[PDB]
Amino acid sequence: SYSIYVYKVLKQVHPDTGISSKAMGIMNSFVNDIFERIAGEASRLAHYNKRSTITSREIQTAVRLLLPGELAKHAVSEGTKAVTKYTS
Amino acid sequence: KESYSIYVYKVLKQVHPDTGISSKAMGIMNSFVNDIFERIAGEASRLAHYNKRSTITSREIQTAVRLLLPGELAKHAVSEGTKAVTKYTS
Amino acid sequence: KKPHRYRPGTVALREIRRYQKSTELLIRKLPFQRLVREIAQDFKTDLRFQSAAIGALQEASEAYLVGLFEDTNLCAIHAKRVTIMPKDIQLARRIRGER
Amino acid sequence: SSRAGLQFPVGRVHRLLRKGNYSERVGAGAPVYLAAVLEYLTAEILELAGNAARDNKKTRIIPRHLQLAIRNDEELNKLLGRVTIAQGGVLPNIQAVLLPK
Amino acid sequence: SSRAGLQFPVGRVHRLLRKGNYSERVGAGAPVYLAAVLEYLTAEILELAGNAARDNKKTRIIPRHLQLAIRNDEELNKLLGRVTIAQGGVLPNIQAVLLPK
Amino acid sequence: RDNIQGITKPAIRRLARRGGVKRISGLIYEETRGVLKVFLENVIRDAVTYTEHAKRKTVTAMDVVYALKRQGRTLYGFGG
DNA sequence: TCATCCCCTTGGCGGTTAAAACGCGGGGGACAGCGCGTACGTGCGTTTAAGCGGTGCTAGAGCTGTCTACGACCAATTGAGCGGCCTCGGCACCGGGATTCTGAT
DNA sequence: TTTTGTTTTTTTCTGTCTCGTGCCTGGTGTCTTGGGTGTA
DNA sequence: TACACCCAAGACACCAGGCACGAGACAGAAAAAAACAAAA
């Protein structure tokens, strides 16, 4: 599950703040739902373009279509930064 | 560009030998068939992924039809699917 | 001396604030569990249920009922009324797409 | 198609289910079941549309006929609740409060 | 995860995307992008929840804090419109017509 | 038998107070119970379908989550 | 090795626990009516940008060849999460002190 | 008591409907082998 | 979880009506008069 990762993210954004088990389960369910939504949108975008490979462009388009406005812009910027850091 | 216009016309001639269909109605029927196909396929894929199964059989399609179609429509579709499966297996 | 008596409207808003500040389950556990088991018995006999599933069902039902009550209060206020009526619930369920 | 007694294609449905990114393997009865369900739905919709066209004195099916056939049926309207039919219009329903007297 | 500077797992996301039956091939940038987006969303939600908890003199994030963080944010409420949070409650909103005149 | 009466008047009153309802009528409780029964039946039908598709006799929380997601009521905190 | 009493332990008939439907005091306003109020319904006159039909200009995806490198699949290597074990404390519940809208004067 | 919506009855061209018909593309037999169930 | 088993995926070889291109025609909107119940 995404328990240790959510805990590390919380410690990064709030060094003096805990999280209960129900909140951890809610965060894991939210992460899984976002994962499923973005994966389905990327698969649909790849099937609409006669493509059999999902790249970073499909995920960026899925994020721009799902997330609204500033959230989508910030997520796209973070994903582009992560991709440029991983490819280098 | 593939389409189910021929099969829709055949079904119409089967249910109404003296009745035509316009182009917009044909496109609407094609869109309806595509939407039903996509919905049932997605439901079957979800049912297969929930059970850790990599194969989609007639049971998954029957469950998808029972979950999507409501009541009498679902019952009639399940009966027709079972009859078609029995006729194809024999 | 006449004992204290609150006018119609004070304790109502007090309970509104109390139940909007707290997030506890307002529906009892045993009657809701019995109702869920009775409803599931009509579809398939001899069915077992886990605690997490019943809790999720209760939470979803409570959230849906809270949303429906919000829509009903909005419809009642829109009609220049304070008390909620079944017509407001019907209008809310018709606009939401349930009916 | 000919073995299952259905006019809809079985091989095309199987190919679309294989290349549709749904599962790693597709069974032999799943495309037949899906084609049978699609054929039943299409037959019901086309019969209702033909009845509506005969009630409108026309030997063709127009989007208005499809709309009048789908919106009139309860289960068909519940299945296609979030579906917008182009050039189909709405049902001629007028509230009793707006009527005179 | 270490090469991209992210806390979310990259190999796990890649394996999930490969086993989820979404496409025939999966690139190397798509899992990194998805993990980065998930990490940013989780960070925003956790920061808002921590702010809501500090506003209530609490050191542990409870579902009520998550509900107050999601409902107060406009973008988070638009993204999670049809999402129900268990044990989260609602916002303390009272209409003006119900107040004593 | 007749378990729909379990949702008594105080439960409906509390659920209305949570939604911001100040005054409640008399015919509200019956309609609320009916709508709750309809929603519970609509969810439990899909839950039982999902459970029977898995050849199981115990309705788990995952089946309820899937039935609520396939309808339009995404619920969190019940996937563990 | 293949018949009575009688002490009392297993069956079914009697007791407290946490809130609301009658029973009553009762009143704020929905319903129906009085009465004031003004924006445009419908018809006319007048003006115009969409409709239909051409008429002339211009680019970019559909489709066809060419070249390519990260994607898939194979043998070694390896590292911290899960399960489990051990430590530690935040606040729900208790009870009292301090604070506070609300009705009656 | 008189003016105005609603329903019935002629043709007449009018957008469309099935027939006539050629190319080929997807509509059928036959060998192999084997992996997804059938039943336990 | 185990042993068995049998029609499909693949591939070779052979074969038949759809579908769009025209055409004679086919039920119907319109053009227009004339006529009955209900509304104002």
Curated annotation (Swiss-Prot), chain A:
The modification Dimethylated arginine is found at residue 44. The modification Omega-N-methylarginine is found at residues 51, 57. The modification N6-acetyllysine is found at residue 50. The modification N6-methylated lysine is found at residue 81. The keyword Disulfide bond does not apply. There is a cross-link at residue 85 (Glycyl lysine isopeptide (Lys-Gly) (interchain with G-Cter in ubiquitin)). The modification N6-(2-hydroxyisobutyryl)lysine is found at residues 8, 11, 22, 50, 73, 81, 85. The modification N6-lactoyllysine is found at residues 8, 50, 73, 81, 85. GO terms for molecular function: DNA binding; lipopolysaccharide binding; protein heterodimerization activity; structural constituent of chromatin. It is found in: Nucleus; Chromosome. Keywords: Acetylation, ADP-ribosylation, Antibiotic, Antimicrobial, Chromosome, DNA-binding, Glycoprotein, Hydroxylation, Isopeptide bond, Methylation, Nucleosome core, Nucleus, Phosphoprotein, Ubl conjugation. The modification N6-glutaryllysine is found at residues 8, 11, 73, 81, 85. Similarly, monoubiquitination at Lys-85 (H2BK120Ub) by the RNF20/40 complex gives a specific tag for epigenetic transcriptional activation and is also prerequisite for histone H3 'Lys-4' and 'Lys-79' methylation. It also functions cooperatively with the FACT dimer to stimulate elongation by RNA polymerase II. The modification N6-succinyllysine is found at residues 81, 85. The modification Phosphoserine is found at residue 1. One of its GO terms (biological process) is antimicrobial humoral immune response mediated by antimicrobial peptide. The modification N6-methyllysine is found at residues 11, 73. The modification N6-(beta-hydroxybutyryl)lysine is found at residues 50, 81, 85. The modification N6-malonyllysine is found at residue 81. It comes from the Eukaryota. The nucleosome is a histone octamer containing two molecules each of H2A, H2B, H3 and H4 assembled in one H3-H4 heterotetramer and two H2A-H2B heterodimers. The octamer wraps approximately 147 bp of DNA. Heterodimer H2BC11 and H2AZ1 interacts with VPS72 (via N-terminal domain). Belongs to the histone H2B family. This is Histone H2B type 1-J. It comes from Homo sapiens (Human). The chain holds residues 37 to 124 of 126 of the full protein.
From Swiss-Prot, chain B:
The modification N6-(beta-hydroxybutyryl)lysine is found at residues 1, 52, 83, 87. The modification N6,N6,N6-trimethyllysine is found at residue 52. It is found in: Nucleus; Chromosome. GO terms for molecular function: DNA binding; lipopolysaccharide binding; protein heterodimerization activity; structural constituent of chromatin. The modification PolyADP-ribosyl glutamic acid is found at residue 2. The modification N6-succinyllysine is found at residues 1, 83, 87. The modification N6,N6-dimethyllysine is found at residue 24. Glycans are attached at residue 79. The modification N6-methyllysine is found at residues 13, 75. The modification N6-acetyllysine is found at residue 52. The modification Phosphothreonine is found at residue 82. The modification N6-malonyllysine is found at residue 83. The modification Phosphoserine is found at residue 3. The modification N6-crotonyllysine is found at residue 1. The modification N6-(2-hydroxyisobutyryl)lysine is found at residues 1, 10, 13, 24, 52, 75, 83, 87. There is a cross-link at residues 1, 87 (Glycyl lysine isopeptide (Lys-Gly) (interchain with G-Cter in ubiquitin)). The modification N6-lactoyllysine is found at residues 10, 52, 75, 83, 87. Its main location: nucleus. The modification Omega-N-methylarginine is found at residues 53, 59. Core component of nucleosome. Nucleosomes wrap and compact DNA into chromatin, limiting DNA accessibility to the cellular machineries which require DNA as a template. Histones thereby play a central role in transcription regulation, DNA repair, DNA replication and chromosomal stability. DNA accessibility is regulated via a complex set of post-translational modifications of histones, also called histone code, and nucleosome remodeling. The nucleosome is a histone octamer containing two molecules each of H2A, H2B, H3 and H4 assembled in one H3-H4 heterotetramer and two H2A-H2B heterodimers. The octamer wraps approximately 147 bp of DNA. Heterodimer H2BC11 and H2AZ1 interacts with VPS72 (via N-terminal domain). This is Histone H2B type 1-J.
Curated annotation (Swiss-Prot), chain C:
Signal peptide: none annotated. The modification N6-(beta-hydroxybutyryl)lysine is found at residues 21, 44, 87. The modification N6-(2-hydroxyisobutyryl)lysine is found at residues 1, 21, 29, 44, 87. Changing residue 20 to K: In BRYLIB1; uncertain significance; no effect on protein abundance. The modification Phosphoserine is found at residues 22, 51. GO terms for molecular function: nucleosomal DNA binding; protein heterodimerization activity; RNA polymerase II cis-regulatory region sequence-specific DNA binding; RNA polymerase II core promoter sequence-specific DNA binding; structural constituent of chromatin. It comes from the Eukaryota. GO terms for cellular component: Barr body; chromosome, telomeric region; extracellular exosome; extracellular region; inner kinetochore; nucleoplasm; nucleosome; nucleus. The modification N6-acetyllysine is found at residues 1, 21, 44, 80, 87. Keywords: Acetylation, ADP-ribosylation, Chromosome, Citrullination, Disease variant, DNA-binding, Hydroxylation, Intellectual disability, Lipoprotein, Methylation, Nucleosome core, Nucleus, Phosphoprotein, Ubl conjugation. The modification N6-glutaryllysine is found at residues 21, 44, 80, 87. Its main location: nucleus. This is Histone H3.3. It comes from Homo sapiens. The gene is H3-3A. The chain holds residues 37 to 135 of 136 of the full protein.
From Swiss-Prot, chain F:
It comes from the Eukaryota. It is found in: Nucleus; Chromosome. Changing residue 53 to R: In TEBIVANED4; results in severe early developmental defects when expressed in zebrafish embryos. There is a cross-link at residue 69 (Glycyl lysine isopeptide (Lys-Gly) (interchain with G-Cter in ubiquitin)). The modification Phosphoserine is found at residue 25. Changing residue 41 to Q: In a breast cancer sample; somatic mutation. Changing residue 18 to L: In TEBIVANED4; results in early developmental defects when expressed in zebrafish embryos. The modification Phosphothreonine is found at residue 58. Keywords: Acetylation, Chromosomal rearrangement, Chromosome, Citrullination, Disease variant, DNA-binding, Hydroxylation, Intellectual disability, Isopeptide bond, Methylation, Nucleosome core, Nucleus, Phosphoprotein, Ubl conjugation. There is a cross-link at residue 9 (Glycyl lysine isopeptide (Lys-Gly) (interchain with G-Cter in UFM1)). The modification N6-butyryllysine is found at residues 9, 22, 55, 57, 69. The modification N6-succinyllysine is found at residues 9, 55, 57, 69. The modification N6-propionyllysine is found at residues 9, 22, 55, 57, 69. Acetylated as part of spermatogenesis progression prior to histone-to-protamine exchange. Demethylation is performed by JMJD6. GO terms for molecular function: DNA binding; protein heterodimerization activity; RNA binding; structural constituent of chromatin. The modification N6-lactoyllysine is found at residues 9, 55, 69. The modification N6-(beta-hydroxybutyryl)lysine is found at residues 9, 55, 69. One of its GO terms (biological process) is protein localization to CENP-A containing chromatin. This is Histone H4. It comes from Homo sapiens (Human). The chain holds residues 24 to 103 of 103 of the full protein.
